[PDB]
Amino acid sequence: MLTYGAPFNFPRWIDEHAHLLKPPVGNRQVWQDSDFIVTVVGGPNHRTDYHDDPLEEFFYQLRGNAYLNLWVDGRRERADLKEGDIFLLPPHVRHSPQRPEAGSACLVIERQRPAGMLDGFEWYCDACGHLVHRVEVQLKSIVTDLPPLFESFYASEDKRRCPHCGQVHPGRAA
Amino acid sequence: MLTYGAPFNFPRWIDEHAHLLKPPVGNRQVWQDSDFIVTVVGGPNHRTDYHDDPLEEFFYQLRGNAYLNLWVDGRRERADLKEGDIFLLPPHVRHSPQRPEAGSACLVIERQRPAGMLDGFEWYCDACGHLVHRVEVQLKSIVTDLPPLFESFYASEDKRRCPHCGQVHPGRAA
Ligand SMILES: Nc1c(O)cccc1C(=O)O
Ligand SMILES: Nc1c(O)cccc1C(=O)O
Ligand SMILES: [Fe+2]
Ligand SMILES: [Fe+2]
Ligand SMILES: [Fe+2]
Ligand SMILES: [Fe+2]
C-alpha cells in the first residue's frame, strides 16, 4: 500500500500551510511515522542553540534566504542558504539555523534515529566560546521535543552560566 | 569539516549537468560517499524492471513530468509525478519509473543500504502478470550496479521466460 498517500503538489502544499510556517510553529512535517523525516521550515525564526545531529541533514532552500551558524574546524562560521541552494550537512557538525525572512521555506530531510543514537543541543558562550551547556535526547519528534529543552535552558541561570568565564548566556534572544 | 562542500545553487547545477540527464546516463548523484544518496534523474528513460527497495524513496519532480508504474495491493497502478509533485514511497513497493520527457529532472533521495539488506529488481509477464525473474543485489551504486543486471536479463530468453504461461518477456523495450 501507499502508506504515505499519493504524490501531491509541493508549492501548493507550502502555500496552504503558510500560516504554520511562521511563529509560533515555524516548521511542519510532511509525512508522519516515516523513516525519512521530511519537513518544511519557514520563518522568521532565530535561535541560540547548536544542534548536534548524529545523522546527516539535507537542506533545499526553496523560498527566501536563511543561513546556518556553524562550528567548523573549531571556529564559528556561517553557511548561507540562499534561495535555490541545496546542502548536505555531515553528522555531528554543530549548526544553529537562522531564518530571518517571513515567507521563506526550506525543505529539510533527516532520518529517524535508532534507539540509543542521541541528538545533542548545545549553547556556547558569546564572550569566550566555551561550551555552556549540552542536553542529549533520544529524539522522537523534530518538532515537539526541542522547545521544552530550550525552555529549561532559558529558565536557568545555572545552566546558562559559562563554566570558563562565568558569563551568564542571554538565554532566548542573542 | 563540511565533508560535502558548501551550499550551492541547485537549478544551475541541474543546468550544468543537463548533458548527463539524458541518454545514455540519465541520472547523476549529487554527493559521493554519503549516507543520503541524493540524485537527479532526467529523461527520456523508459525501463521494464520493477525496483524493490528495502528502504524508503523520496521524490520531488522539479522539472517536467514522469510517472511510476506500481504494484499496489496486487494490481498494476500508475502514480504520476507531475512537475512540482513530491512523493514518499514506502519500503518494498514495486516501482518502475517512466520518464518520457527530455529536460525533465526529478530529485530522488534514498539511503545507503546496510550490509545484508538487499535490493530486488523484478520483471513481470505482460500476458499473465506472474513474476518472470528477480535478481537481488547488495546495492553499492544507485547508478552503476543496475545496468549489468538489466543486460543479463535482456540477453537471456531463459530468464525472460514466464514460468506460468511460457511467454518470453520482450526484454529491453516494452
Ligand atoms: N535543521 C533543522 C533541524 O534539525 C530541526 C529543526 C529545524 C531545522 C532548520 O533548519 O531550521
Ligand atoms: N527511483 C529510482 C531509483 O531507485 C534508482 C534509479 C532511478 C530512479 C528513478 O526514479 O528514475
Ligand atoms: Fe539540525
Ligand atoms: Fe565564557
Ligand atoms: Fe527505486
Ligand atoms: Fe506469463
Side-chain angles (χ1 to χ4, degrees), chain A residues 1-74 76-174, chain B residues 1-74 76-174:
Chain A
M1 303 292 278
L2 302 188
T3 318
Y4 308 121
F8 58 92
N9 180 270
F10 201 23
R12 182 150 66 247
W13 183 96
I14 297 165
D15 293 347
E16 271 163 22
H17 298 80
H19 49 287
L20 325 178
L21 316 166
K22 57 147 160 69
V25 183
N27 68 22
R28 175 58 152 214
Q29 190 166 314
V30 175
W31 297 281
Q32 292 303 321
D33 300 311
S34 50
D35 185 50
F36 297 12
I37 299 179
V38 179
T39 71
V40 181
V41 192
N45 195 356
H46 296 83
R47 51 206 298 213
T48 48
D49 64 283
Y50 287 76
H51 184 192
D52 165 12
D53 190 332
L55 302 170
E56 289 169 9
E57 304 187 7
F58 169 83
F59 298 80
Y60 182 12
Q61 183 75 34
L62 309 177
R63 308 180 180 184
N65 312 105
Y67 59 97
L68 307 177
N69 287 333
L70 304 173
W71 290 95
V72 180
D73 210 29
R76 307 200 207 72
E77 318 285 12
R78 161 175 167 156
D80 295 85
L81 295 177
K82 300 171 296 305
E83 183 176 294
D85 281 343
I86 50 161
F87 171 67
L88 188 61
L89 193 66
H92 301 294
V93 179
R94 307 317 206 252
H95 56 294
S96 186
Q98 305 307 313
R99 296 185 180 284
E101 309 190 352
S104 59
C106 194
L107 170 62
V108 177
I109 299 176
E110 290 179 22
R111 302 173 33 201
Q112 294 286 343
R113 283 65 143 159
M117 184 180 303
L118 300 192
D119 284 65
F121 296 87
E122 300 176 325
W123 290 264
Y124 292 83
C125 180
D126 167 56
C128 74
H130 212 279
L131 170 75
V132 165
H133 182 72
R134 163 172 177 109
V135 184
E136 307 178 299
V137 293
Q138 181 76 57
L139 195 45
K140 296 304 182 184
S141 49
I142 256 297
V143 335
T144 70
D145 275 345
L146 301 211
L149 202 142
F150 302 157
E151 280 298 314
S152 63
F153 172 81
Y154 313 145
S156 178
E157 296 214 323
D158 211 73
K159 306 173 194 290
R160 292 191 271 133
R161 172 170 293 113
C162 179
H164 168 95
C165 79
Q167 191 139 48
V168 179
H169 184 295
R172 195 212 295 292
Chain B
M1 303 292 278
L2 302 188
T3 318
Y4 308 121
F8 58 92
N9 180 270
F10 201 23
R12 182 150 66 247
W13 183 96
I14 297 165
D15 293 347
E16 271 163 22
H17 298 80
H19 49 287
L20 325 178
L21 316 166
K22 57 147 160 69
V25 183
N27 68 22
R28 175 58 152 214
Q29 190 166 314
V30 175
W31 297 281
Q32 292 303 321
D33 300 311
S34 50
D35 185 50
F36 297 12
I37 299 179
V38 179
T39 71
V40 181
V41 192
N45 195 356
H46 296 83
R47 51 206 298 213
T48 48
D49 64 283
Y50 287 76
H51 184 192
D52 165 12
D53 190 332
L55 302 170
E56 289 169 9
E57 304 187 7
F58 169 83
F59 298 80
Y60 182 12
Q61 183 75 34
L62 309 177
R63 308 180 180 184
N65 312 105
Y67 59 97
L68 307 177
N69 287 333
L70 304 173
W71 290 95
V72 180
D73 210 29
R76 307 200 207 72
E77 318 285 12
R78 161 175 167 156
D80 295 85
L81 295 177
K82 300 171 296 305
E83 183 176 294
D85 281 343
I86 50 161
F87 171 67
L88 188 61
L89 193 66
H92 301 294
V93 179
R94 307 317 206 252
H95 56 294
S96 186
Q98 305 307 313
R99 296 185 180 284
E101 309 190 352
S104 59
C106 194
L107 170 62
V108 177
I109 299 176
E110 290 179 22
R111 302 173 33 201
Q112 294 286 343
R113 283 65 143 159
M117 184 180 303
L118 300 192
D119 284 65
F121 296 87
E122 300 176 325
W123 290 264
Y124 292 83
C125 180
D126 167 56
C128 74
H130 212 279
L131 170 75
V132 165
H133 182 72
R134 163 172 177 109
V135 184
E136 307 178 299
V137 293
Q138 181 76 57
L139 195 45
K140 296 304 182 184
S141 49
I142 256 297
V143 335
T144 70
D145 275 345
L146 301 211
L149 202 142
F150 302 157
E151 280 298 314
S152 63
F153 172 81
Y154 313 145
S156 178
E157 296 214 323
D158 211 73
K159 306 173 194 290
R160 292 191 271 133
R161 172 170 293 113
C162 179
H164 168 95
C165 79
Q167 191 139 48
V168 179
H169 184 295
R172 195 212 295 292

